Structure formats: structure tokens, C-alpha cells
């Protein structure tokens, strides 16, 4: 219940070199439950 | 029976910077798409930047790139135009003007071809020593 709300910010965070202070996690061993923050480090155990 | 006026430009020494500011009479911003163009003494129009309708896109040309900034205030209903790191070139006029709808590179068109309906008188900014 709620509202989501966007709005494109390509003048204010761009920079011509392109921001990279922009982050993410792609690789995480387990779904975060609802309403949960990763801020942790950890070497990701791809293989064996 | 709209009018878009100008104001800003004068002698600048070389380094400075300056804030050219257009305003609308009769239209709205946030509506039409604002351009810049600037002409020089014995050479042809070029425009200098743009903003489209709607948020607005700023779009530069290539030898006015990473020292020229636009901005676009909907509450004075003005489009300013912030000139940093000013060479010994730009020695010339500059016309603010407006067109319709979303028009600064849509497609395979770029608001160098000079078709835009509102214009301006201009203002000259002019560096020397």
C-alpha cells in the first residue's frame, strides 16, 4: 500500500566522464526479505 | 504579439563570466523547447544550446561543450544562460528563441537549421583587452 514516484535527472547527475560513485549488488547468495539494506562486503563464492 | 527579451552580455575580459537571461512575454516555458543561436560579423548563425519541453534535455553544440551551461526557471518564467571560460572568439550577438512542442533532436534533426517561430533582438557580449 503506497505510492511509487520518478522523475529523470540527466542535468544534475550525469558528468561528462560519467558518476560512478553509483552502486549496486548483482551477486548476493540469498533474496533480502522486504524493507531489509546490505551494506556489507564479501567475496562472492562463484565456484568451487 | 509575444516578446522574448534579453538581457545580459557587455565587455567581459577573456576568463570571465557572464549570465545572458531570456525571458517570455506572452508564452510559457516548460511548453516550448528554448534554443540559443549566436551570429558573428562577416560569418553565419550557429545556435549555442537547447532545452526541450518537457524536464528539458540541455543540448550543446561541439565547441561549446563543458564550459557553457543552460538552465531553465519555470517560477520567473526565464531561460538563463551561464557563459564560464570565455576565449577571445565569441566575439558576436546572441538571440534567444522558442519553437513548439519537443524539437531539439528528435529523430534525425538538430536545432542548427534555423526554422524557429519566436524570436529575440539579442544582446552582444564582447571580450577584448
Known amino acids: 500500500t503506497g505510492c511509487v514516484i520518478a522523475w529523470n535527472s540527466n542535468k544534475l547527475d550525469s558528468k561528462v566522464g560519467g558518476n560512478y560513485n553509483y552502486r549496486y549488488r548483482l551477486f548476493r547468495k540469498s533474496n533480502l526479505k522486504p524493507f531489509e539494506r546490505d551494506i556489507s562486503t564479501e567475496i562472492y563464492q562463484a565456484g568451487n | 504579439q509575444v516578446q522574448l527579451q534579453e538581457s545580459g552580455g557587455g565587455l567581459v575580459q577573456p576568463g570571465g563570466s557572464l549570465r545572458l537571461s531570456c525571458t517570455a512575454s506572452?508564452?510559457?516555458?516548460?511548453?516550448?523547447?528554448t534554443g540559443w543561436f549566436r551570429q558573428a560579423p562577416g560569418k553565419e548563425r550557429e545556435g549555442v544550446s537547447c532545452?526541450?519541453?518537457?524536464?528539458?534535455?540541455?543540448y550543446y553544440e561541439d565547441s561549446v561543450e563543458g564550459r557553457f551551461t543552460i538552465s531553465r526557471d519555470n517560477a520567473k518564467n526565464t531561460v538563463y544562460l551561464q557563459m564560464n571560460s570565455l576565449k577571445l572568439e565569441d566575439t558576436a550577438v546572441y538571440y534567444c528563441?522558442?519553437?513548439?512542442?519537443?524539437?531539439?533532436?528528435?529523430?534525425?534533426?538538430?536545432?542548427?537549421?534555423?526554422?524557429?517561430?519566436?524570436r529575440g533582438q539579442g544582446t552582444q557580449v564582447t571580450v577584448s583587452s
Open positions: 506572452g508564452i510559457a516555458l516548460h511548453t516550448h523547447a
Open positions: 528563441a522558442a519553437d513548439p512542442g519537443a524539437v531539439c533532436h528528435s529523430g534525425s534533426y538538430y536545432y542548427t537549421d534555423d526554422d524557429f517561430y519566436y
Open positions: 532545452i526541450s519541453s518537457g524536464d528539458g534535455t540541455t
